[PDB]
């Protein structure tokens, strides 16, 4: 069997993935406890933060653990129902996380640029969160519905089985649509919003420089951490000859670590900027 990796590399990837999932889920559930438990930080302004924390925790736990335990030896252990479940729900968690970052950036832009305009009500906030989750599940539905568990000699695979085309049109158009709706447009929106906010907002002045520097870090690390994910998932429609050996296994594991590195950053940013969040992380541990 191919993709039977030696033990030391599996130990190294297991150590790195265990560290990243532990710090991500600990940070996200602590952000849950601080926003939803203290009842003075419970505001309409932080509902997008709760939605983002939920989507990042779901991302980290479900997506990272099941993809890593699948991709260590390329053998699926959970059956066809959980194959459908993993092809449906954590992809929607990823999509809702990126859309919730877009909503947070929109709120910060419309607040800092236009402070005299009123903040959106709880009804419009709930409608925006609902539209985010419905569009996330709707875009993750074609992978969930077309999933199939297949049996090969000494191998069980969870793969998306589209109807066959002579030019492979369906999955190529789907992955192009996923790329343009998940990497391009939210990056352009968050870049325009944070560029305008940083230009306008660039003693208490040092807090403003810290805020502008931190959103520069956010935009740069979003672009860096989500370039090779879409690059590899659009790779087989351009150069399909790279799937001969375990080189593509190492590439997949490396880009999954780099793409799931973006989960940790928001608790780090909230702890570095706000003082009551630092008090909350001090009180929780």
């Amino acid at each position: 069997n191919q993709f039977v990796q030696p033990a030391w590399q599996i130990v190294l990837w297991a150590a790195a993935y265990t560290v990243i999932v532990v710090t991500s889920v600990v940070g996200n559930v602590v952000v849950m406890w601080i926003i939803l438990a203290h009842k003075r930080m419970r505001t309409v302004t932080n509902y997008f933060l709760v939605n983002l924390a939920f989507a990042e925790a779901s991302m980290a736990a479900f997506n990272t653990v099941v993809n890593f335990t699948y991709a260590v030896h390329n053998e699926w252990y959970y059956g066809l129902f959980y194959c459908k479940f993993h092809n449906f729900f954590p992809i929607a968690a990823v999509f809702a996380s990126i859309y919730s970052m877009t909503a947070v950036a929109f709120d910060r832009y419309m607040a800092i640029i236009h402070p005299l305009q009123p903040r959106l009500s709880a009804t419009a906030t709930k409608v925006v969160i609902c539209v985010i989750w419905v569009l996330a599940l709707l875009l993750a539905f074609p992978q969930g519905y077309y999933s199939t568990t297949e049996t090969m000699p000494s191998r069980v695979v969870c793969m998306i089985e589209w109807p066959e085309h002579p030019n492979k049109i369906y999955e190529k158009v789907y992955h192009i649509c996923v790329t343009v709706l998940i990497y391009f447009l939210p990056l352009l929106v968050i870049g325009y919003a944070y560029t305008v906010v940083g230009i306008t907002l660039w003693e208490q002045v040092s807090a403003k420089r810290k805020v502008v520097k931190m959103m520069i870090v956010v935009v740069c690390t979003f672009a860096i951490c989500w370039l090779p994910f879409h690059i590899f998932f659009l790779l087989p429609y351009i150069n399909p000859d790279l799937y001969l050996k375990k080189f593509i296994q190492q590439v997949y594991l490396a880009i999954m670590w780099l793409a799931m590195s973006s989960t940790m950053y928001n608790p780090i940013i909230y702890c570095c900027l706000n003082d009551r969040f630092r008090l909350g992380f001090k009180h929780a541990f």
Partner: peptide
Amino acid sequence: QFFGLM
């Protein structure tokens, strides 16, 4: 083939 998943 590898069959990576999102």
